[PDB]
Write a protein that binds this ligand. Structure first.
Ligand SMILES: Nc1ncnc2c1cnn2CC1CCNCC1
Length: 263
């Protein structure tokens, strides 16, 4: 790969996370470009298994997908990507900033993530783990889809039933997850299905249960969520449709919107 860079060119500065996969750092590339750097522990995971997230990232390029910059392919492995200054969308919604986010910023964020996924749709990829913990936020409220560790070319509260039960993962099961993501945005990052354990969630959703309209969220936005949660996967809307609806929301759908205490 022309993706390869020399080890001298990477300076790992501040640690940002741990795991069984390894760890993630903020750093510099070529002493100029700020970057996110992902480490594998040479022992714990397969080298080929860790490198697969990068393999898929080489083919995909879009302004709302976190961009690969470089790799170090030999053990110890490093994966260099663009640095997203504000952490995961989940931490952003739950944190100091969440207090001031109102519906117009939240729906814009939704529109951006929809655009990223529309690209994934057009390329015939599936993400399979779309949720606020796997979206990253940059300067100026930019949201980008991250973490294609599971993403192929054909977490039960975020997973569509047909996927969780029978392994049928498609772009339409991603659309379900997007519905769940809309509730994370509109509740400031609260865990979906509050007070329900996982075993209870599978049961309920199979029997037709769906989350109610979150406090102060317009019913038209809840109705979009319910479209993303249709039992029949092929009756769920496309990411191209969702992008456009969200982009146009405040003119076409909710032109009379007024600010409230939380949304
Ligand atoms: N590209 C990135 N920029 C900034 N932080 C990052 C990344 C990639 N991963 N991380 C670490 C976050 C830290 C918050 N929890 C989700 C993972």
């Amino acid at each position: 790969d022309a993706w390869e860079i020399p080890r001298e060119s990477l300076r790992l500065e501040v640690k940002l996370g741990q795991g069984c996969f390894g760890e993630v750092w903020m750093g510099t590339w070529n002493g100029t470009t700020r970057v996110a750097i992902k480490t594998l522990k040479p022992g714990t995971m397969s080298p080929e298994a860790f490198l697969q997230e990068a393999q898929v990232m080489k083919k995909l390029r879009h302004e709302k997908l976190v961009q690969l910059y470089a790799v170090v392919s030999e053990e110890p492995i490093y994966i260099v990507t663009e640095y997203m200054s504000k952490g995961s969308l989940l931490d952003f919604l739950k944190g100091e900033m969440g207090k001031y986010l109102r519906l117009p910023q939240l729906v814009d964020m939704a529109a951006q993530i929809a655009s990223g996924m529309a690209y994934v749709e057009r390329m015939n990829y599936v993400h399979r783990d779309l949720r606020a913990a796997n979206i990253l936020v940059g300067e100026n409220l930019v949201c980008k889809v991250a973490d294609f560790g599971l993403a192929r070319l054909i977490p039960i509260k975020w997973t569509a039933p047909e996927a969780a039960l029978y392994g049928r993962f498609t772009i339409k099961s991603d659309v379900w997850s997007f519905g769940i993501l809309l509730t994370e945005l509109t509740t400031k990052g609260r865990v979906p299905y509050p007070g329900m354990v996982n075993r209870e969630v599978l049961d309920q959703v199979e029997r037709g249960y769906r989350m109610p309209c979150p406090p102060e969220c317009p019913e038209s936005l809840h109705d979009l969520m319910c479209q993303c949660w249709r039992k029949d996967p092929e009756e769920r809307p496309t990411f191209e449709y969702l992008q456009a609806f969200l982009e146009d929301y405040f003119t076409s759908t909710e032109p009379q919107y007024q600010p409230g205490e939380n949304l």
